[model samples]
Target: INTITFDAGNATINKYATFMESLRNEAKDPSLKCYGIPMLPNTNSTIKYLLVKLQGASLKTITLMLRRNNLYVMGYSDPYDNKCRYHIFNDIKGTEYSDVENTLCPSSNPRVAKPINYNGLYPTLEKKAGVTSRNEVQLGIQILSSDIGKISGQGSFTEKIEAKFLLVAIQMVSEAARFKYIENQVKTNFNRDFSPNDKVLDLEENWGKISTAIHNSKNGALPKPLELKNADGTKWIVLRVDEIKPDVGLLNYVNGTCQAT
Candidate 1:
């Protein structure tokens, strides 16, 4: 239904975008054969995407797991009919760091591969069962398709923004309630259509700074609190973080572990 060219700063493919497009195409093809990856916005080292390869055809075994990889591909084989009956799946999932396009996949039935090397923590924005909630998909699609170029440019300070990775950054601060709150905090806040969310982790200008502070320090610290106040009066402060650190643990959307806390 959607056409776009696309996540993670690391993935060669975007696992979820491929999955989302699959849902849209369910009417045309309900049977999945070979499949899909996701990363949070503004954060790093998450399994946000994968590069589908060879059209997932082999043993018919579907594989979905959380592990460290650069290039991910799935090809499932049908037992009785080894024939590769399939269509090309082209969906792009992207972020400020990279763009990964994926192909259609072999069916995996609604089962997930247990984490092979799950360190009790994974950095993906993928929300496991929650992905099936179609209502949330539109915004996800909008972010994936529209934000690619803007995300690429925003690091350089361009006006256009709002993409995949940003979702991750905002959920990290203390006054984590409502996207509208974050918007209101902005002195030059722009009008938006969607209710960002009830809870949010405030954001900083340098996405990298936000990402690094979490992993590098692994301590209780947050992005510097910013506010506008000067003798000149026209001050520009980024945020007014109510607390010093995040109030809640950063849970992995997929497995429900406090991956970043």
Candidate 2:
């Protein structure tokens, strides 16, 4: 077991310092495409790890993201909590596929993402076979970043690190998950399902296989890894979403929907 040992009997001070130090010094870079951290089991992003790239990100911004996502430093718990800090440079692989603007997430706009109600889009139930509920997952991801300096002062040092970590984790997994889900949508196999499990070993291998040119070519690579923020860090944005699939039943029928990308 990895232990976050205490020093000088100052548990709080030492632990906090230990975590902060780990934030800046550990895993500064990776040779692999990105860092794949497995998400907790049974959760929405389960069986998958948010693939994040932290090549040259500052310790300050990185910590802020985790806190924004779900990793908290307040609660004395496991996994999500900052019990044992992890370094960004622990095992860096490559900066190859950390690009945020990949085929799935090409660009962004003022209202790039938001919660929408599709009930009005599709009307009526008494049609072709009966009341059919359509389930759709597109290959896309939206990430928001802003000037974290202002709110960065909103919490303690412990709180700061956790916030940054959480957001990074959330965006990575959500981005990766959506891409994977879309791949299975138009597959020519009988084992296609949007559900991902821990059985998945390395999903980053096929991140942007959207085109043969983008596959192994070295030029015109658009999807770049997500950095701190747009210029100043004064921005509110990010992106990720778990899915809910409706299996066919007696009362309602389920249909999988996809678009050619």
Candidate 3:
């Protein structure tokens, strides 16, 4: 197994910040993509918490650490909505893993129970599902930064963070459900299909389709206006093809600055 060290650097932070700035610009530019809010700095805290959770730690412990250190953390309803309903950490205790699992994700600041919504920006699907899909082509970038922040001390140093980030862009002429269906179909067809020997082949087949669709649609004109709705069938909002980029870099604690260093 390969081991990696974690340190912070200003140059790395700037690079991420600059990329986010460009994404913000893309979001604002109507000709390029759709208008959406950028994930803010505070959201970085939640992302970091998630990184810890992914690393097999309890959210309760993570919350305790953040609160104990005088670091501020507030979670929004979702990164897509700028109307923030912040939830600060309120409690912590050291307990067994099973007990931690039960006590960690209370209604107060429920991060553990949250599901990864694979929803994407599509017209017919949004209308049918009565929900708005997001344009998150570069979501992995944020994930990478969050993972690095959680493990590799939040400062700057020389040496790349030895973690792999996968970015797969996919476009399909059909709806998002169709893409999901295809994915499920592959799994159903191949019993015990994800063994190590078959892993690379499986990824190639699945990701290949998605990558092709994304590339093909990169230059295509935007489709007609699509209406979004809530789970209860309440009409929510219609999103226009306007892309905007906002700053989303993890702030360094050491130097009191907004980048890794």
Candidate 4:
């Protein structure tokens, strides 16, 4: 019998328990107590692909919704989490007058205006199940135990090394998929007019504009950028993988640890 153990981290205890409960109650037999988070053969799949069907429209819709409702969109402090907090700006009504000189009177100005009491939308969303803090993550591990076959002492080290290499291959593919998912999101927002195949540096430079736009419009906060290795100590470009990679690295290798999106 193989004895599998999982150690869900302090932050995701309830999440892990909920996952296990679902596996037993919905997937595996109710009597089953132990099973992998993704139950193997699922490592190849990415959560982004599963959740986002229309990445561009989804992002745009979310942005439009926030802007229309007078809600202040907060930038992500951590790009890895793709987090943006929103708050209602009650003073916006009186402040719109401040910008009146830049444009014609409200009746003549051909521009849309933000909504009032935008934070109230949150409660409305909750009622409709459109807004939620609940997040899900899927991770997979394939174990090649020494006890797998109980074979003789011949070539055991070679087999172990092979298993480890396999693990690396799996991780690389997963990361590649995740990277592509993010790239798609960025592209959707940027549109096809911009060069899409540029290297990481170029993409970051271009995306930084979008990031700034998002921040100013929504009043969102962003996490600090990861410093680059250059001698000048330049920061990495916006929306790239530097922020998200470290967090994924932690959960992937940290025995039984989990981080939610």
RMSD in angstroms, all models? 17.6, 22.1, 21.5, 25.7
User: Which candidate's TM-score is highest?
Assistant: 1
TM-score of 3: 0.16
Cα lDDT, model 3, residue 85: 21
lDDT of 2 by residue, 49-136 (tens): 1222221111222221121122212111111122222222212224412221121122342111111111111112112112232222
Error of 2 at 70 (Å): 23
How does each model score on lDDT? 0.25, 0.22, 0.24, 0.23
lDDT of 3 by residue, 1-261 (tens): 011111112224344334333322322212221122211222223222211111111111112111111121221112112221222212322442223333334445434322112222233323333333322222232333343344322223221221111111111101111123323322332222221122222322233232222222222322333333332446433232221011111111121221111
Question: Best by lDDT, which number?
Answer: 1
Per-prediction TM-score: 0.22, 0.18, 0.16, 0.18
Q: What TM-score would candidate 2 get against the native? A: 0.18
Error of 1 at 42 (Å): 13
Q: Rank by lDDT, descending?
A: 1, 3, 4, 2
Residue ranges of candidate 4 with Cα displaced over 4 Å: 1-91, 96-106, 109-116, 120-261
